[PDB]
């Protein structure tokens, strides 16, 4: 797929996800959310939506990814939602991977008011 | 497919979920968690499962998705489990939008005790 | 699947999700992260990943799954990255259910740079 940017890497074909990088230092104290920008922006393949999904490697320090769904149709830049739900103060540094994007395919169904039995 | 409630809408073919509604005014402290009733009750197509995640919108005020998975044999009416995570007090309003429900599809593996290599 | 440990219990075809069980008890103040071990190691099929998501009952009580990618070729045992985001003390007894394991397929694209339009 195309993509524009430095901030996601090349994945395995084994791998379930791309990694995806911060752009620039963040500091968090505890309870603090932040918008942390990537600088990737792309065309989702048709058919598709992206899962962005935090690592393990952050995800043990006690940092959660908030929100996280990608539609086909996003064109503007990825930024991750993070939140330190830990009792201690974090630094991200620049370009540490700090999430993982997931090609996950589209089901879509009409709604039928009916009565469900 | 089949729904009961207008707790939920119609999403674009392109969307990857459909929005869900907070059917009543919801007040939470920091550090409070509380299931948010949507009203809605549906009959999910066989063969997948509905993943609840969280919006954007309110994932950057600090609130997050608990648990979230709806097995296609679910016939109760759909809560929402919510944190805020943050450190600020924060009121839903009734009919805001608080998730999305996303159809993925379900994949049955039978187990085998052997020995991983 | 070739599974090897007891800490993952059979689904029924229409679940989503195999339920993955604490192989300790396990102590979380308000604000702690702990890794919970399950005992089990897996052969994930070729084609799929694995999704580790928290359980509504044990969601319901303020306790979050952070990560939660096992690629398929994971060996490795299973832990579940947990914490307590409530303000209350929780006691996870030995073999309680912690969270669920959902196999989804995976999707590989190569990342073409180009200009998002
Ligand atoms: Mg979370």
Same mark, same amino acid.
């Given at each position: 797929?195309?993509?524009?940017?430095?901030?996601?890497?090349?994945?395995?074909?084994?791998?379930? &996800?791309? #990694?995806? /990088?911060?752009?620039?230092?963040?500091?968090?104290?505890? !309870? %603090?959310?932040? *918008? =942390?920008?990537?600088? @990737?922006?792309?065309?989702?393949?048709?058919?598709?939506?992206?899962?962005?999904?935090?690592?393990?490697?952050?995800?043990?320090? &006690?940092? #959660?990814? /908030?929100?996280?769904?990608?539609?086909?149709?996003?064109? !503007? %830049?990825?930024? *991750? =939602?993070?939140?330190? @739900?830990?009792?201690?103060?974090?630094?991200?540094?620049?370009?540490?991977?700090?999430?993982?994007?997931?090609?996950?395919?589209?089901?879509?169904?009409? /709604?039928?008011?009916?009565?469900?039995?």
């Amino acid at each position: 797929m195309i993509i524009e940017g430095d901030g996601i890497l090349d994945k395995r074909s084994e791998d379930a &996800g791309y #990694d995806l /990088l911060a752009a620039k230092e963040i500091h968090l104290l505890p !309870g %603090e959310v932040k *918008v =942390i920008p990537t600088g @990737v922006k792309l065309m989702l393949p048709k058919g598709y939506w992206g899962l962005i999904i935090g690592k393990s490697s952050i995800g043990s320090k &006690g940092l #959660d990814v /908030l929100g996280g769904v990608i539609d086909e149709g996003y064109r !503007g %830049e990825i930024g *991750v =939602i993070m939140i330190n @739900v830990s009792r201690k103060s974090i630094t991200l540094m620049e370009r540490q991977k700090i999430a993982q994007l997931i090609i996950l395919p589209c089901k879509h169904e009409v /709604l039928e008011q009916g009565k469900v039995v």
